[PDB]
């Protein structure tokens, strides 16, 4: 028994269904065999101790889920997933990780196996902090996040949550994996959009930290304030509404 929640109920059927649905919503990925995807996903963690998972265990899945996204249309995020996804629902040429096949399959799910049987553990799974870091879920997200960040080019945008105690958190997935795998030259600029929950939050100490990290990788940094995120989304969808324009 572990400290974290058990595998999501009907995990096999959920992955299969998500794969089929993805290939329906995204016709460009209809060449994938969803049964093969599931077999590869399961192969990464079944009959294995869930504190000894490696990026290599997920390689077969990564190969099968290969997806070349337009490298200049990537939206990263940290602690504000819902808004980033709402944005790509209205700005449909842009992609977050969870708009790719592999990210879509796993988003909000939990899974693990055990060393001595081919059973999925529905009772409990390792918590990153309390139990162990190299667990099936954490290793999956580390692997796919690294690869997605590696593939980005030109200007990369990131939404950050302006209401958090740390707007930029070096211990977040964004701060510990994604930001350190943006490639210089390939990526010219990282532009942060700080989402308000009316000061200029681009002067926040943690934003100055992010700027330093990025500049040390020889990438330019830009920061913007999104003062009204829901209104922002409305105006992305329909910019011709008069509430999209400042009063004279």
């Amino acid at each position: 028994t572990w400290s974290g929640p058990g595998t999501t109920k009907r995990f096999p059927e959920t992955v299969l269904a998500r794969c089929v649905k993805y290939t329906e919503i995204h016709p460009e990925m209809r060449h994938v065999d969803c049964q093969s995807v599931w077999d590869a996903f399961k192969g990464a963690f079944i009959s294995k101790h869930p504190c000894d998972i490696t990026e290599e265990d997920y390689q077969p899945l990564m190969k099968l889920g290969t997806q070349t996204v337009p490298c200049n249309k990537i939206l990263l995020w940290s602690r504000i997933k819902d808004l980033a996804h709402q944005f790509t629902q209205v700005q449909r040429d842009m992609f977050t990780l969870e708009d790719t096949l592999l990210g879509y399959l796993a988003d909000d799910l939990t899974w693990c196996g055990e060393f001595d049987t081919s059973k999925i553990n529905y009772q409990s799974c390792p918590d990153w902090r309390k139990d162990c870091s190299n667990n099936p879920v954490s290793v999956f997200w580390k692997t796919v996040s690294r690869r997605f960040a590696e593939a980005a080019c030109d200007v990369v945008h990131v939404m950050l949550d302006g209401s958090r105690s740390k707007i930029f958190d070096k211990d977040s997935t964004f701060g510990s994996v994604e930001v350190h795998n943006l490639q210089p030259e390939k990526v010219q600029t990282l532009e942060a959009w700080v989402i308000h929950g009316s000061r200029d939050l681009c002067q926040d100490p943690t934003i100055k930290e992010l700027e330093s990290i990025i500049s040390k990788r020889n990438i330019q940094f830009s920061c913007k304030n999104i003062y009204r995120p829901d209104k922002f989304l409305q105006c992305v969808k329909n910019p011709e509404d008069s509430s999209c324009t400042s009063e004279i």
Partner: nanobody
Framework: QLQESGGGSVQAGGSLTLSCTASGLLFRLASMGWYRQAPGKERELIATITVGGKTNYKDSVQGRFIITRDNTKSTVTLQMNRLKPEDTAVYYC???????????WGQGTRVTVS
């Protein structure tokens, strides 16, 4: 990110056309505007334009100025006709959106009407 041009000196009654190139995704998604600042005065918004080209003007320039837009870069242009000494100012282009900041500013372009 913001580069303005087309200013100069003209006689009262004359015309100038200002241009601004704005580089960035947020400019492409936002309503844009032309602002101006007279030497000892507050910066004022004088003209706005939606992504699709719907315009609005301050009463003091209505009928004399025309704002246009071409669309990640947006170019925003301000045609200024029948110029008055009161139009003397530094002109700036930026976002004019309640959703997104007019965070940073270009150098502006100086207009002097004698």
């Amino acid at each position: 990110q913001l580069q303005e041009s087309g200013g100069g000196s003209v006689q009262a009654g004359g015309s100038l056309t200002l241009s601004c190139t704005a580089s960035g995704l947020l400019f492409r998604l936002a309503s844009m505007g032309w602002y101006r600042q007279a030497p000892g005065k507050e910066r004022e918004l004088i003209a706005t334009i939606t992504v699709g080209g719907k315009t609005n003007y301050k009463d003091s320039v209505q009928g004399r100025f025309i704002i246009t837009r071409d669309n990640t870069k947006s170019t925003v242009t301000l045609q200024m006709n029948r110029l008055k000494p009161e139009d003397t100012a530094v002109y700036y282009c930026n976002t004019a959106s309640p959703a997104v900041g007019a965070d940073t500013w270009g150098q502006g372009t100086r207009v002097t009407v004698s």
